[PDB]
Design a protein around this nucleic acid. Structure first.
Ligand SMILES: [Ca+2]
Ligand SMILES: [Ca+2]
Ligand SMILES: [K+]
Ligand SMILES: [K+]
Lengths: 300, 295
DNA sequence: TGCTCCCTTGTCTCAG
DNA sequence: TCTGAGACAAGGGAGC
């Protein structure tokens, strides 16, 4: 996630009738789904329960989901971190629950959100389902938020209403903080938007700071906004060095590690036998339950 | 004022209808009225100090309060250390002339008006203290009437017994509170606000016990959490903690201890009609509308 | 030389 | 002069 970015983006959110998503293929970001389900229960096989509940919600509206998972963790994402777990079984048995629903999946090389962004650019999907805001910085758009509680978000609306483009968002993160960077102490959603509007880019921002700190003549012209921003930056002891902004943060967002495979996904059909004989064994579900749920799913 | 003190005291307050204050002798803390009338009225409005003091005076008299006003004199060095248009001599003698014509007694405190106010009570020259300055409690103030000149708020009565009964805070508890929270006399410890400062007193009894525990260690749940909190704010508890000086300036401020009763005299219409016309152009007709009821 | 809302942010806890 | 929410506190600014 990028800190408080949903707060900034949210006023561009637009509602969407769940009906209208019929036959739309979606990249579903489930990189953290199992983890969440482990930590939000007052229980065992919650991931299977949680996955199933959600899978049925996607199918109920004719969504053609393709599930994506996490691979490795990128270098930048690690060095920023140093400053009940996920078992391969739990993973396998939800991928298995997908296959038996006929739902395809991939495991991303690195970050899932990055991958989802790639598939959408490759015309392999028509929408991306996630609650992770980093998807915007990786180039993603047509985001569907709060699918499981619905808010449509896209790069156009952000550009057109907030004036933020791809470069702007990658830079906002370097103020607000994110998985790739620590941000600037003192800069939250309001100030970081003020800075980008006023200074245009982080390189311009830093010159104004350094120059002003190197020769006090430079500040003589400064308006109220700049004057008050200086003290704040100073009282928080902000040093803006060579690696501000980071070319590495930029590159990591603009060229994330992703699968560029153009081969389309295949969507099968929910195998009522294997599904009923999965729920029964892993959860203890009688057939009369799964069939009441699944039969209207197969035949609509 | 002691930082955040009014939020700790707040639930101990009991509301007051103004009609219940008739004939009570009332020390008024006018120490900052002039500087505020300048800062708070404009469109800086000329002679706001006169109009300001005028309205407030009449409000006190409408409810039959016999007030005695108290102005700042000096500024204690410990206050000057801590911090590390204008109010003119004419404004002061102007509002004080007005007070004299109303037949209202007034004094100028050796130092802090709040402290003098607390003293006046302690000597039974008055029956209550009208101020909004939380520092008054540390000066041993009590029977304190807050919000007397709001605006949105109603008026709240505070006293040292309620505070002790409800909150478990005596005067020494409060003087040490002000060293966790900061005030005019100390900047306090950073990261210690109302909630946790209160908890420290109720667990350690005093800043001495609080220190030992923190230093004896820096060389359970609550104590470990607090220690992480203190360390991450980088708190230094030296020999000056708590401070005898802060303690002395609150327990023994400089005040006039004269036991001589004040004397309230009737307002003088003719004199008052004159003053307003000279300063503000208020015709005798207008003044009579406000004044004659009050005689 | 006011002091107080209240906005903006930083840390931490807690639970869905 | 895992995220989201929410509780606590620092640190400002704008206004009677
Ligand atoms: Ca992410
Ligand atoms: Ca005071
Ligand atoms: K930040
Ligand atoms: K404090």
């Amino acid at each position: 996630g990028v800190h408080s970015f949903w707060d900034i983006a949210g006023p561009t959110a637009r509602p969407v009738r769940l009906e209208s998503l019929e036959d739309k293929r979606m990249a579903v970001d489930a990189s953290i789904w199992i983890y969440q389900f482990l930590k939000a229960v007052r229980v065992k096989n919650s991931h299977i329960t949680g996955f199933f509940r959600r899978i049925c919600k996607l199918l109920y509206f004719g969504i053609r989901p393709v599930f994506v998972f996490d691979g490795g963790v990128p270098v930048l994402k690690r060095e920023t971190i140093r400053q009940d777990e996920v078992t391969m079984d739990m993973i396998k048995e939800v991928q298995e629950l997908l296959s038996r629903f006929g739902i395809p999946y991939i495991t991303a090389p690195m970050e899932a959100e990055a991958q989802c962004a790639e598939l959408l650019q490759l015309n392999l999907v028509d929408g991306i389902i996630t609650d992770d805001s980093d998807v915007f910085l990786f180039g993603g758009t047509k985001i569907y938020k709060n699918m499981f509680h619905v808010e449509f978000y896209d790069a156009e609306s952000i550009l057109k209403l907030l004036g933020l483009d791809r470069k702007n968002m990658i830079e906002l993160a370097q103020l607000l903080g994110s998985d790739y960077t620590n941000g600037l102490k003192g800069m939250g959603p309001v100030s970081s938007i003020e800075v980008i509007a006023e200074f245009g880019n982080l390189k311009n921002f830093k010159d104004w700071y350094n120059n002003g700190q190197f020769d006090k003549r430079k500040q003589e012209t400064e308006n109220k906004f700049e004057k008050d921003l200086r003290k704040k930056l100073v009282n928080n002891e902000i040093i803006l060095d060579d690696d501000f902004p980071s070319v590495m943060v930029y590159d990591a967002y603009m060229r994330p590690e992703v699968d560029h495979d153009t081969t389309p996904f295949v969507w099968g059909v929910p195998d009522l036998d294997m599904l009923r004989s999965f729920m029964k064994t892993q959860l203890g579900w009688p057939h009369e339950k799964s069939d009441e749920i699944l039969i209207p799913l197969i035949r609509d």
